[PDB]
Amino acid sequence: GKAKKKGKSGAARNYMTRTQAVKKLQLSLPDFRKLCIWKGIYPREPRDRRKVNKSATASTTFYYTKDIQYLLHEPLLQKFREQKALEKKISRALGRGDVSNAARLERNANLPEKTGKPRYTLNHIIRERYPTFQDALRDLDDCLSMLFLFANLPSTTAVPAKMIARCERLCHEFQHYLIVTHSLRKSFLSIKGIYYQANIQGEDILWLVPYKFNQRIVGDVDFRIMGTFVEFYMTLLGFVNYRLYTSIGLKYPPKFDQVKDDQGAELAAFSLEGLNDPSQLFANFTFFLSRETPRQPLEFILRAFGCKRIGWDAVLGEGAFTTDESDPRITHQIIDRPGRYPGRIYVQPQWVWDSINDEELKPPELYAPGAQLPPHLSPFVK
Amino acid sequence: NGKVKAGQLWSKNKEELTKILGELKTELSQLRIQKISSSGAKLNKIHDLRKSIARVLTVINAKQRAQLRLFYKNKKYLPLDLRPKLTRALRRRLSKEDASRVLEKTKKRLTHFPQRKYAVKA
Amino acid sequence: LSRAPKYPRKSIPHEPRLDEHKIIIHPLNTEGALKKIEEQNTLVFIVDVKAN
């Protein structure tokens, strides 16, 4: 019938640029990028970008029109608008000098610095993004690497200290689940960090944890969108931890002792309670970790592979089985320094990783202090 | 055949009612096709099928509206078709309580000096 | 802002006005149609005037 006009169909209708998407959603750029990261809207590339927009360049970002249409019905848009209006009310109250009204309006803002949680709730987004717990377990690699990396940073404006503490607490709860289920399988010491591989419900989960040192935040990364990733991943890991604890029939969240955490218990601040073979490799031994040894990976690995009596120095933290080094019940001692009590096996830390990787107890004479260590092989590469 | 009583339809629920509407429309179509080519009792059977379709649609609509009234029983705003009709002037009329509101002075006067019951001797 | 009404104006969505049983009424049984059946492999129907 009537002749069609050029550019009214095809890739021009299919794709949308970032500027057009922002103007269509009537959002700001930080809110748009945050929503795209949270909802999984990924950049796309047309075959010919001039057919979509004549002013587009090689740095132009294209999205799907149907993806923006789906973003139009997200309930977090009204949350953004209500939070902006609430902030305007708080500014008005502070400018008029009503401090009580300002505090009362501020307590409804749900600030991450005072809650430890994300500002905007992503619970409905979690079910949309992960229809199945298997998909959640498959994205747990990225989630665990992300949260274990941000467990050890100083507080910033994007990611506050209470949010970092919640990251560390969720990671500790996941580690406690792995310990009580003996799901940890392999570990590796690389030049970048410590690789951990576990098996949860038939799914292999591999993640990387940095060595406990001062981590450098460089300007080459987008730290605020990394913090948005952190918020999404803690929202995922909370429900993952809840489902795993309910499946093993334990109460969630676990009882957490603030006094012990204050004294430095770390993993020892949690007490797990009930609701209402390589796993016993270190069951009969008693370990003593010296202060120059990596306490959190050593404790996690030993407790996951069956050790029940681990002590350490008093500066390593509260919750040790014993503190004095002269305890006669100690069987093995981990030292890494360049006066040996009798009836005790002194080995370097690499003995623990080698023993858990080969599922057998290594000869201690090859791991004697001051000796040349055997090479540390990768347990993942056959 | 083709005559479906409303008493049977009032006990069915949604999906089998939609199904039976499907077959009733179906043999409506094919008995129109045999109507244009022959004659007999099909000319009464098509009327029976049409009335059966009307009954099924009526029952489905009535059950849907009853469910919607049950859902909107305790809400402030109702759909306009579920709102009472009355007339336009009756809908724009003042409510009974707003019409019966009185001032505080009038309330005091009616409380302490109402219309009394009395009689006069002859 | 887009509309976020507190109640739907119409409680029940309308059933589709033109379904297949209303589109197709009856085939044509004339000499032209009954020739076209074997001449052109074409079936002739009487349909609704609104259907495309």
Next chain:
Amino acid sequence: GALKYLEELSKKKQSDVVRFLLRVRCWEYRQLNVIHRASRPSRPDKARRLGYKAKQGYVIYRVRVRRGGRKRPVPKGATYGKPTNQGVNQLKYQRSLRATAEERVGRRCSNLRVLNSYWVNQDSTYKYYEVILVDPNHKAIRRDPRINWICNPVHKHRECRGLTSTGKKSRGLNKGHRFNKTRAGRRKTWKRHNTLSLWRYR
């Protein structure tokens, strides 16, 4: 109360302060549109004594109307019947420019009810009025027994029937010997006087 002081101040319309205020307000209202909403009444004491309240549902609309006489809309302004001994320049409208302003404001806001109106300023070309309007559909209005009489359907368009103050003034609804022809309705009284009554046993 300050409204007593505003009353005695508004009585003195030829004082320097009131003349200056009237001049600047005349300029402002002439620069504004012919009919426009006023955010608040410019004469709060006059509005309050005429019935305005600071309550949701009460609005004020300001309006200017061209003043002078009324011209009959005949072509070339000339009548071709029997001679009338006068021109169309001296024909007078039987209602007030205040009533005309009230009707125009009511047509602008047909959903509301005109309560009353008052003169605010004037010049050679226009007269300026402010009209108080009440929302009959507002819950705060409908719950008040002092004002919910205006929610009844008998009070639709009082300004179009002459039920306002200027309407009663134009209709001459006053008791006495001076208002014999108009106190109960002029055309009704004329029909009553010119009807012929014939009883059965006459």
Next chain:
Amino acid sequence: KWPEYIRLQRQKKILRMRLKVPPAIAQFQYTLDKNLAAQAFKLLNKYRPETK
């Protein structure tokens, strides 16, 4: 070419400066200075009315 409301408010301010203002209105141009206003509000901020 400013909008009519901006033009109206600016020309209204200009007109009130151009015309001769009677003393009863012109006396409002002389107000408290910054220090005395600050001290007055410092005293009056202790005596705000009771909240809800």
Next chain:
RNA sequence: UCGUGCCCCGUGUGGCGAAAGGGAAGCCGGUUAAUAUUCCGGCACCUGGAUGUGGGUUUUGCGCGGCAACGCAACUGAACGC
């Protein structure tokens, strides 16, 4: 990234109004009782969209030839202008 903004531009304003004005593109043969540049057979065209193949161009990055008029199957071209 002071993350909740900034930059560019001026021309205004919408609709109806022509089966003879302007306009993207279909011809031939056959066929009915009555329709046909509309149906059937053959042979085409226009508009719009997506995306392949061949060919073209390119390591002298965006063709070559003719003095020239210009030619050749291609042979980048946004804003803003003529």
Next chain:
RNA sequence: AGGUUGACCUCGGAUCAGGUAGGAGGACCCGCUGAACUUAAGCAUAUCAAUAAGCGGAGGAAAAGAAACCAACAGGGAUUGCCCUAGUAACGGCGAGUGAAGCGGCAACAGCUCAAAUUUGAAAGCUGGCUUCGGCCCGCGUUGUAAUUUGGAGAGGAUGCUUU
């Protein structure tokens, strides 16, 4: 940070949340506007007629209505309608004509609400949203929303009984 951060006022936008108006009918009702034929010997006052036509706006009735009234009495006492006043008072080219009201008898009867006051020892008032239906919020509002007062009075006192 002060070239900043805000509070107000005014004016806008939104397929924002919830509503409202248009048109019909128009016998009767409330207004606007408004003739001529006719009757005056003819005819510009007049009469028809403050009518027909035209325009705007309501309801089962509408309108009016509780005196800036009538009166001049030994005073009556909101409005409306009937009878009477009364073809009277009065108006009117060159006269054809026009024309009320008070009282009186009856029908039916019904009274009231604001503005002008400081609650100031406590905006006590209200729209909307969410509700676990207890309430909690966003607000409107002191340039005034509640209680009290309306000329018949009332406000302040004194006093001793009654009413819900």
